[PDB]
Design a protein around this ligand. Structure first.
Ligand SMILES: [Mg+2]
Ligand SMILES: [Mg+2]
Ligand SMILES: [Mg+2]
Ligand SMILES: [Mg+2]
Ligand SMILES: [Mg+2]
Ligand SMILES: [Mg+2]
Ligand SMILES: [Mg+2]
Ligand SMILES: [Mg+2]
Ligand SMILES: [Mg+2]
Ligand SMILES: [Mg+2]
Ligand SMILES: [Mg+2]
Ligand SMILES: [Mg+2]
Ligand SMILES: [Mg+2]
Ligand SMILES: [Mg+2]
Ligand SMILES: [Mg+2]
Ligand SMILES: [Mg+2]
Ligand SMILES: [Mg+2]
Ligand SMILES: [Mg+2]
Ligand SMILES: [Mg+2]
Ligand SMILES: [Mg+2]
Ligand SMILES: [Mg+2]
Ligand SMILES: [Mg+2]
Ligand SMILES: [Mg+2]
Ligand SMILES: [Mg+2]
Ligand SMILES: [Mg+2]
Ligand SMILES: [Mg+2]
Ligand SMILES: [Mg+2]
Ligand SMILES: [Zn+2]
Lengths: 71, 132, 129, 218, 216, 101, 83, 25
RNA sequence: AGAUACCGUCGUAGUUCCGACCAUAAACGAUGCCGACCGGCGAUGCGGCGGCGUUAUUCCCAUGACCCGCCGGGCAGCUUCCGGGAAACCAAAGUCUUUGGGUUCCGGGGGGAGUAUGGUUGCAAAGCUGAAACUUAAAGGAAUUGACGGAAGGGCACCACC
RNA sequence: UAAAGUUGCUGCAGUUAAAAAGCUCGUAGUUGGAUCU
């Protein structure tokens, strides 16, 4: 079980600090790889130049052609 | 097969319960009584019911049956069940007891009984089935 | 090894109370245990108890009345100020009409209400209700 | 017309029992639905909580039945819950109503602080379990209201509780278990030994023993 | 018996117990049937304390008498050895007898033909009449049992430590219980022996019936 | 989902048990797990008994018996029908079948 | 139980088990309310007075109702002291 | 694919890489 | 059909011993250790204690072999509405919303992946530590009713056979 | 940020759903039986 001593504050805090890294969202927010890989770089919006128009096929079981743009 | 369906058996049992006095061991008299007392809209069904009533009456005459019980039969069984011997089987001039039983009686200040006779206990203590 | 004697005694008392027993044997004895039992008895939860005195640490036989729902211990013994008592009362007690938190203060071993009356803090030992 | 088939029903019909608390005192099981109608009467209101289709796989195909959850109460200290599964919805609802009013328990109400006026909250913290669902009821100050999910709130209101705090753990998406856990938690209020119930109990004549001569006649 | 001299056990009752063998138990002992035992002799047979048996019988009689309507007491026997004793007890006292098979749902299924609501239950063997015992827990029914050295005591309130194996012992126990109930009611007197002998409650054993039929 | 409490073998309070060889297929199987069968039979069959008793030079000469210890793995025991599958409640019963008449 | 004004505010007062002091609930169908008759010390007939005991179903399931009833009767003097 | 054979395939691929991806290179 | 397999004949490392490496297994009770409390029953192994009676040491104690009990550790078994749990089941997997005896390791939806890279150990095979980009709305546990089985046992039929 | 008792000190889990090191020793750390008015 967990240690319940009166002088175990360092152990508890260190263990929690180390086990927070096994949370997907905490590690994603605090590691920096996701921010580097994000094309917007953390911005809510961005401006671009339309390279072309494309059509993406909808995944099954739906059938359609979604109109998109490469920018 | 000649197994009787539950309709015939139920009707026969009810008829024997209600009219035990009027019935007997004759199939034809039984089938004449059945049409008198019961309403059977078929001749073959009446014959089957009468033929089962005769068999059941013979079985009753042989002895008690697991199913129906007649009021007269119940009253006669009461008389057979009030059988009483002239003397009590519990009355014995000598009753054999073990020394431990005598000690238990003595602890209840009943060690002065004259009917008691102390018997020698068994020398060997072997009362278990041999494991194997 | 055994490191808390009050915890073992309270666990034994609670287990015997759940089973409907009339008497409980708790060993080893301790004056902290005697104070806790006296505090419980003053409120009518257990009843009279007898200390059997062998030449090593003693034993206690406690009579039960069936009025005890839960008696427990808090480990470690946390320092409780007089302004933080209400939080422990909310966390540990079932209602505000009954139940007691047991504290060891500089005046002695008592309940939380008696410590409020005497205006003193201390260390929490356990609770019962 | 009502023709009782049990001794308790005959006693209730012949006006030998004053209140349902007499039956609750002796923990006598209730087997006839007409007793509750006789005592609680018009104060009872019911509400359908869920209609759930269940299916049994057969050789030709699935066979479907419908299960109704019905909660009932008089908003003045009594509450009951019933579950009934049938082929048709209406039959299941009628059966659920009957089964809910059959299993009606009283509710004990207490105070949070100063004991002034009528009781408004639960006497203490009470816990109920059903499946993986755990429900905890905590006393609340007057005027707080019921702080809970929609499903337990209906049962708490029908019981007559005005103020209460609620905690819940487990898969509460199972509506049946969620309702049964809080029903058990509510039922546990009269089973808790508080210090004000420490007085020795004075026994009284049981209705079976008290009215035996009248029962012999009928 | 609250130490009253009138309720004390007499010598003739002790002789009847010794003749019937009610003091002889089994080789196995139940851990909750140990306060009524006296001592285990050789061959593994346990001996029952007859004074405690008398005390339990008197307590059961007091419990039975307290019921106003005699028909509210049900006496049940499943084994053949106890059926005649139960029938005679019901005839002499006014209780309701159930001899033979007990139909499940008798106390719970209210739409059956044999549905009943007894106020007290008396059984001959907890291990053989377990079905009526289990249904007692559903309808708040106190139970009285004739237990042995090895017998479970779940749902049993008043246990009478007798020998429930032999026919003579069972018949004697039922006869004495009926006698005590009648004497407490104020029907027969304690000054003279009861008119009926305890052999009317014994099992017939149709082998004995055949032997007696050909006696003359 | 455990199927048996004893894991289908008789190993208690020890780590390893030496393996033996199946009589039928020569598979390696732990000794405690294997199905054992002790066969005591007659060398000569029923008809051979009467045929031989007349041709013997001795009087009331008792024919010798054959004693064999057979070990089977689970697959061979099931296939040879010396062991069969049972109901979930009947698996617990470990009394040998009533071969004694 | 009662408010500050002293008025009692409860639907009913449940009875407690005589053996274990536990509360017997409204849905406890294994509980027993048994009566034991009192006899006259001179004649031994039914006095008309009785003593009432109540046992909860938890004790009965434990098979401890026999001993509890025996002790209750001994305490009340119904059973002889030299039992 | 059985996990044992998948592990064996991964090990063989790693050995092939190690032979091709020489430390000298 | 095809066998580079299952089957059969041979047969190399190996299988055996000594000295150096390797440290991995469904290395499993898939269940960390220490301590307290909480129901019954019958066996079993070791030690000790008590007690009628059979046997051997030709006599005697005494000591071995049996028999009936008690105590303490140990491997287990049966039963129970002690209580738990999603259940299967568990006298521990209990004494948990009535949540705190001490302490170590360790998990955070499914894949990518125990992979890449760095470090370290090894002669090698490999061992230890150990990601991310990206992708996905489920994957999975226990139990229930059906349908199937080149699974077991019964039953019936001249649209089956004899 | 709460919802998240899905980072659990209050307050989570580790037989089968993710999980207890193959086993033992052992320093630091944590914890430690009664008794003195
Ligand atoms: Mg992902
Ligand atoms: Mg579509
Ligand atoms: Mg959900
Ligand atoms: Mg499987
Ligand atoms: Mg070992
Ligand atoms: Mg191994
Ligand atoms: Mg095997
Ligand atoms: Mg490993
Ligand atoms: Mg293993
Ligand atoms: Mg492992
Ligand atoms: Mg042992
Ligand atoms: Mg050993
Ligand atoms: Mg020994
Ligand atoms: Mg916890
Ligand atoms: Mg993951
Ligand atoms: Mg979709
Ligand atoms: Mg054909
Ligand atoms: Mg042909
Ligand atoms: Mg958040
Ligand atoms: Mg929160
Ligand atoms: Mg998350
Ligand atoms: Mg909390
Ligand atoms: Mg979790
Ligand atoms: Mg796993
Ligand atoms: Mg391990
Ligand atoms: Mg150290
Ligand atoms: Mg200290
Ligand atoms: Zn094989």
């Amino acid at each position: 079980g967990k240690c319940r001593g009166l002088r175990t504050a360092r152990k508890l805090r260190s263990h929690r600090r180390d086990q927070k890294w096994h949370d997907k969202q905490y590690k994603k927010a605090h590691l920096g790889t996701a921010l580097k890989a994000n094309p917007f770089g953390g911005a809510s919006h961005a401006k671009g130049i339309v390279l072309e128009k494309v059509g993406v096929e909808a995944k099954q079981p739906n059938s359609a052609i979604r109109k998109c743009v490469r920018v | 097969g000649r197994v009787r369906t539950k309709t015939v058996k139920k009707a026969a049992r009810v008829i024997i319960e209600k009219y035990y006095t009027r019935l007997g061991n004759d199939f034809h008299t039984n089938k004449r009584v059945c049409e008198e007392i019961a309403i059977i809209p078929s001749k073959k069904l009446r014959n089957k019911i009468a033929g089962y009533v005769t068999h059941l009456m013979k079985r009753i005459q042989r002895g008690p049956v697991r199913g129906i019980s007649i009021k007269l039969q119940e009253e006669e069984r009461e008389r057979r069940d009030n059988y009483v011997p002239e003397v009590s089987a519990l009355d014995q001039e000598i009753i054999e007891v073990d020394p431990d039983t005598k000690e238990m009686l003595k602890l209840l200040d009943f060690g002065s009984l004259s009917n008691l006779q102390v018997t020698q206990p068994t020398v060997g203590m072997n009362f278990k089935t041999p494991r194997g | 090894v055994r490191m808390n004697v009050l915890a073992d005694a309270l666990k034994s008392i609670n287990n015997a109370e759940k089973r409907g027993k009339r008497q409980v044997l708790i060993r080893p004895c301790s004056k902290v245990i005697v104070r806790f039992l006296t505090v419980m008895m003053k409120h009518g939860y257990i009843g009279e108890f007898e200390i059997i005195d062998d030449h090593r640490a003693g034993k206690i036989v406690v009579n039960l009345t069936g009025r005890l729902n839960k008696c427990g211990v808090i480990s470690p013994r946390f320092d409780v100020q007089l302004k933080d008592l209400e939080k422990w009362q909310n966390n540990l007690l079932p209602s505000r009409q009954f139940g007691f938190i047991v504290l060891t203060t500089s005046a002695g071993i008592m309940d939380h209400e008696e410590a409020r009356r005497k205006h003193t803090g201390g260390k929490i030992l356990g609770f019962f209700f | 017309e009502w023709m009782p088939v049990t001794k308790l029903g005959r006693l209730v019909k012949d006006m030998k029992i004053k209140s349902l608390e007499e039956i609750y005192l002796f923990s006598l099981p209730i087997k006839e639905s007409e007793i509750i109608d006789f005592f609680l009467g018009a104060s009872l209101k019911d509400e359908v909580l869920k209609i759930m289709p269940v299916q049994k796989q057969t050789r030709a195909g699935q066979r479907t039945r419908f299960k109704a959850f019905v909660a009932i109460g008089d908003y003045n200290g009594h509450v009951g819950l019933g579950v009934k599964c049938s082929k048709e919805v209406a039959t299941a609802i009628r059966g659920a109503i009957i089964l809910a009013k059959l299993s009606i328990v009283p509710v004990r109400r207490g105070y949070w602080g100063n004991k002034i006026g009528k009781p408004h909250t639960v006497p203490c913290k009470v816990t109920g379990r059903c499946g993986s669902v755990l429900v905890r009821l905590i006393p609340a100050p007057r005027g707080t209201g019921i702080v809970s999910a929609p499903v337990p709130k209906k049962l708490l209101m029908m019981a007559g509780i005005d103020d209460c705090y609620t905690s819940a753990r487990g898969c509460t998406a199972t509506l049946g278990n969620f309702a049964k856990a809080t029903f058990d938690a509510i039922s546990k209020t009269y089973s808790y030994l508080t210090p004000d119930l420490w007085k020795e109990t004075v026994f009284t004549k049981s209705p079976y023993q008290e009215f035996t001569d009248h029962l012999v006649k009928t | 018996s609250g130490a009253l001299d009138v309720l004390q056990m007499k010598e003739e009752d002790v002789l009847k117990f010794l003749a019937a063998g009610t003091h002889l138990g089994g080789t196995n002992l139940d851990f909750q049937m140990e306060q009524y035992i006296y001592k285990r002799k050789s061959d593994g047979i346990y001996i029952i304390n007859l004074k405690r048996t008398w005390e339990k019988l008197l307590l059961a009689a007091r419990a039975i008498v307290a019921i106003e309507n005699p028909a509210d007491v049900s006496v049940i026997s499943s084994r053949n050895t106890g059926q005649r004793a139960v029938l005679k007890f019901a005839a002499a006292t006014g209780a309701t007898p159930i001899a033979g098979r007990f139909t499940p749902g008798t106390f719970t299924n209210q739409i059956q033909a044999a549905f009943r609501e007894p106020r007290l239950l008396v059984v001959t063997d907890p291990r053989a009449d377990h079905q009526p015992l289990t249904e007692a827990s559903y309808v708040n029914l106190p139970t009285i049992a004739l237990c042995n050295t090895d017998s479970p005591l779940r749902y049993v309130d008043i246990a009478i430590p007798c020998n429930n194996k032999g026919a003579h012992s069972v018949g004697l126990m039922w006869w004495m219980l009926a006698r005590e109930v009648l004497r407490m009611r104020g029907t027969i007197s304690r000054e003279h022996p009861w008119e009926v002998m305890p052999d009317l409650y014994f099992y017939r054993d149709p082998e004995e019936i055949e032997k007696e039929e050909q006696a003359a | 989902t455990k199927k048996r409490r004893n894991n289908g073998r008789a190993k208690k309070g020890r780590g390893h048990v030496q393996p033996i060889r199946c009589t039928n297929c020569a598979r390696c199987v732990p000794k405690d797990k294997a199905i054992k069968k002790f066969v005591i039979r007659n060398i000569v069959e029923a008809a051979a008994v009467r045929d031989i008793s007349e041709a013997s030079v001795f009087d009331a000469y008792v024919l010798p018996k054959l004693y064999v210890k057979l070990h089977y793995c689970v697959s061979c025991a099931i296939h040879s029908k010396v062991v069969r599958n049972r109901s979930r409640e009947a698996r617990k019963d470990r009394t040998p079948p009533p071969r004694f008449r | 139980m009662q408010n500050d004004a002293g008025e009692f505010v409860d639907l009913y007062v449940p009875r407690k088990c005589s053996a274990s002091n536990r509360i017997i609930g409204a849905k406890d169908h294994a509980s027993i309310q048994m009566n034991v008759a009192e006899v006259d010390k001179v004649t031994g007939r039914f006095n008309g007075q009785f003593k009432t005991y109540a046992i909860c179903g938890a004790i009965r399931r434990m098979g401890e109702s026999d001993d509890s009833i025996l002790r209750l009767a001994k305490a009340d003097g119904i059973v002889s002291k030299n039992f | 694919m059985r996990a044992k054979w998948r592990k064996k395939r991964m090990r063989r691929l790693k050995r092939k890489r190690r032979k091709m991806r020489q430390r000298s290179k």
